[PDB]
Amino acid sequence: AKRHRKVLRDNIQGITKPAIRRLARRGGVKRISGLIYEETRGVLKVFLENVIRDAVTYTEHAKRKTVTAMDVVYALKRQGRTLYGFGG
Amino acid sequence: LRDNIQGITKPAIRRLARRGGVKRISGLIYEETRGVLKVFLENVIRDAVTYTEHAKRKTVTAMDVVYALKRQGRTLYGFGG
Amino acid sequence: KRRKTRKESYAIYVYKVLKQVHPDTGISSKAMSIMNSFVNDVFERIAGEASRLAHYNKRSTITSREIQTAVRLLLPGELAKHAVSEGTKAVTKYTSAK
Amino acid sequence: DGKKRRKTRKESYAIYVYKVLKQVHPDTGISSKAMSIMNSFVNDVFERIAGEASRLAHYNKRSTITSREIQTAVRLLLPGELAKHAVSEGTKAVTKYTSAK
Amino acid sequence: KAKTRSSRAGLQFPVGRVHRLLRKGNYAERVGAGAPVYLAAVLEYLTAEILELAGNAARDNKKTRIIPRHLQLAVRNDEELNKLLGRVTIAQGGVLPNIQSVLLPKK
Amino acid sequence: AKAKTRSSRAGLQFPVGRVHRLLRKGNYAERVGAGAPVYLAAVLEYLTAEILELAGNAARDNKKTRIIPRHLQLAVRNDEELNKLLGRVTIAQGGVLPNIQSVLLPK
Amino acid sequence: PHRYRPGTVALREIRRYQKSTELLIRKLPFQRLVREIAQDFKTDLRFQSSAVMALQEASEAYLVALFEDTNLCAIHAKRVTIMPKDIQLARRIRGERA
Amino acid sequence: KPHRYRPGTVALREIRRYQKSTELLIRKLPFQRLVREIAQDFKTDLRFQSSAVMALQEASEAYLVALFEDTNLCAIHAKRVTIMPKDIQLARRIRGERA
DNA sequence: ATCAATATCCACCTGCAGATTCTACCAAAAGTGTATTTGGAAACTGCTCCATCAAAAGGCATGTTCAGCGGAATTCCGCTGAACATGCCTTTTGATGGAGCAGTTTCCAAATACACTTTTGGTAGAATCTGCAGGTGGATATTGAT
DNA sequence: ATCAATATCCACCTGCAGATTCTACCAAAAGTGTATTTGGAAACTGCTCCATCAAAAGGCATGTTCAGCGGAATTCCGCTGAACATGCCTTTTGATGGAGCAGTTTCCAAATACACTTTTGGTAGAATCTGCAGGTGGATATTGAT
């Protein structure tokens, strides 16, 4: 087997406070409680888990090992969140 | 007199709210509710009628309604599908 | 003296299942209509998802494999686990026989 | 030659979208990302109308999708004013097409 | 002589019917032999799951006949079925008894 | 001996032949009438014209000559019917409409 | 000289209606409403009785669920009384206004 | 003697700035790891087309922005200008994601 | 209401990535003509079950009284926004091995349409049977006044 | 805490709408063998593009200080909904013609799959073009202290 792919852990913290602030600003938010950041991280994790689970299900069904933009697009459509701009 | 939409009475709207777990109701709720129900009915009926006309009938069937509700994301069980 | 075209339904098959689960339990007519709607609803959702799956992968055939992936896409965790096991078991017995 | 390999061609509505764009705004261009969005839009609406037409045919025990199914599907899918105009364009196209052979 | 596909698969649900419905429904050009069997099995299993829970709801209410109310109680009280039927209305099902705590009488 | 495209016969820019074929491969029904793909191509062409008209106007408004995703989003969201038609659609790189709730403003 | 305090009977009503399943709007008034609305889309229409009932089951289920959301909004604002603004917020977040 | 904008002034400036632009707001690499970490827990040895990750990011940001709009509405409803966890919770519950 | 520290507007200017321009070629696709097949409009019409009307049923419209909820006014603790110093890790410009997605062609397990034949599954008129909705009685828990 | 008015429960009862049981009918369907066809797995492998190490660097995250002012606890009173009894008019219920929803048969306009023939939408390549992102700076607002 090939070598080392460093263990991936705690990457949810990569979604920083400034990044969440920015997203809230685009959303029209003017003031933000200190507890919002962790709450938002938990919400994004759920959103991603759900979409990724479906996208990977499409990948495996096609007997591929590579998740395609189409796998994601189909997964999003399934969940009523149709995305334009990446094929399909 | 008393025209149709008003037929949906205060006591009826209060019963609906009770089943929804509501304990206290503002006086302005009743008219707001009627308006909301009207919009709901308009949306569903419009689609049900479209299915009726397509089938060249003069009678709206339960299935016309079931199909209308389904495309509106409000699937109903107990009337055909 | 016309005929009244046959209107199929899962009523009789639902009733059999009922007796296997609760031998001494009945079911009202309205309740049964609700179950018929349920079976038709799940059939459409599963078949539809399986259809899209076949299309996405440029396949002309809907096989047990599309039904399976469809089930995993549609049903919640535990429910999916059991549905898959039941589906696999039924196909095995069917294949493993004549 | 050699062992060439005909990358299977992928179709899109791009050239047709381009034509319509020039009809409405002669001196306006469109980025590739926007065109991809337009291509997704046409496929999306196609699938939705075709799907509504499919169910509609089934509900009425018909095995054929005709312009009549498409028309009803358009009325069920499109909001008010868009439906009215789509129906006219559709009807006009069919009436014209049938007077040409 | 001939044997029903359902019996072969050991199912109560009609494999032959499911097969017929798959094509007439225009889901695909062709239908593999195992598809309708697998699908019939899934439909039967889900049917069994709800009737099981519905029957229990009826028993808990001291009744022998399952009515719409019982199907609703079974579905809404089950996390997974509730999710599966999250956008479905069961006619004459009513709702689950539930009052927001802040609305209760003063302790 | 003069073979004219079904599109030209129909007075359309959108490909009737392609649409007819897509309707068949999509397995929407056993059969497809001749007028079906003509009507559908017309509707698709009309909707495209409608969104391109509005997007080009948004582009002009922002002093741009090339339509980008942002212009498509501005056009769709500022238009009641298109906004409803695409109510559950996300346009990549479209951003959002400027909108600050009144109570958040100063003084 | 008996008199229940404000809220006691309301609470009693909540428990009663949450236990039953019967329709809460009277049939005739509902039917007139339905017919009137349909008249705007197509004149001289007839309705199967089951069509009207299906319309009423769906309408009440929708209104009951909306009232639950509406109640959550009132409570969010620390009130126990539902107001039009609560219904409005609920519909906006559901995407019915939005 | 130093200059200082009042609290809320820069916030409002940021709103206008971000509502005018369309660029993704979450750092790209960190988002990619998050995606790879989550996917890995579901299935090991997976690869990703770069566009698959971008599609996930565009979808994720659109979802969060729209959620923050709903959340802001719930805060304003409670006579506040500060969004709090319960505003997000109320918004998700009404949307039917939670209950 | 004048002032200064700053952000914002903006039309001019330009390197460059993204878009446009073509020569080239081409395999995948679509168009008219049989020849074969049939879905479903069309005409006729039996039989539901829908609109309607009158009598029996029972929910609701209505005014009064006041409990208690909603929100205005006030207070202040401490959380969150603004500003800033420090430096890290994301971003960018590039290149490379090679994993694995995907184009091409060989080929057989499996799928499909009859044609023939069997036993169900659905419908219907008739009689019979029952789970349970209300109805009653008496006991007792709940609510509210004192 | 102590009555006193009501509501709530529970065991029991039985009428009856609706579920169960019996019978005869028969068209709609599904099983299997036979013949014909083909979708797509299998095997070889071109080649796109994914994972990755490489390196410089400034955009942007982190962590801290400071205090403006928002959240939230508290008091409080005007007023608006809740509870309740009164008298009636609307809804419910059961009976009844007959409007259409359909069951039945007829039969042609129209939907193909195949063989040809051909125009074109796609695409691999490199080669000139161009809209505008982004840096610069000077003129016009916007803020916030006084």
Ligand SMILES: NC(=O)COCCOCC(N)=O
């Ligand atoms: N030219 C034609 O193909 C018309 O279709 C009929 C062929 O299908 C016969 C069958 N039983 O496989």
Ligand SMILES: [Cl-]
């Ligand atoms: Cl048509």
Ligand SMILES: [Cl-]
């Ligand atoms: Cl299969």
Ligand SMILES: [Cl-]
């Ligand atoms: Cl209000």
Ligand SMILES: [Cl-]
């Ligand atoms: Cl909170």
Ligand SMILES: [Mn+2]
């Ligand atoms: Mn992990």
Ligand SMILES: [Mn+2]
């Ligand atoms: Mn026919």
Ligand SMILES: [Mn+2]
């Ligand atoms: Mn209060």
Ligand SMILES: [Mn+2]
């Ligand atoms: Mn390899």
Ligand SMILES: [Mn+2]
């Ligand atoms: Mn039988």
Ligand SMILES: [Mn+2]
């Ligand atoms: Mn009882």
Ligand SMILES: [Mn+2]
């Ligand atoms: Mn008593």
Ligand SMILES: [Mn+2]
């Ligand atoms: Mn092949």
Ligand SMILES: [Mn+2]
């Ligand atoms: Mn640092």
Ligand SMILES: [Mn+2]
């Ligand atoms: Mn405050």
Ligand SMILES: [Mn+2]
């Ligand atoms: Mn009042």
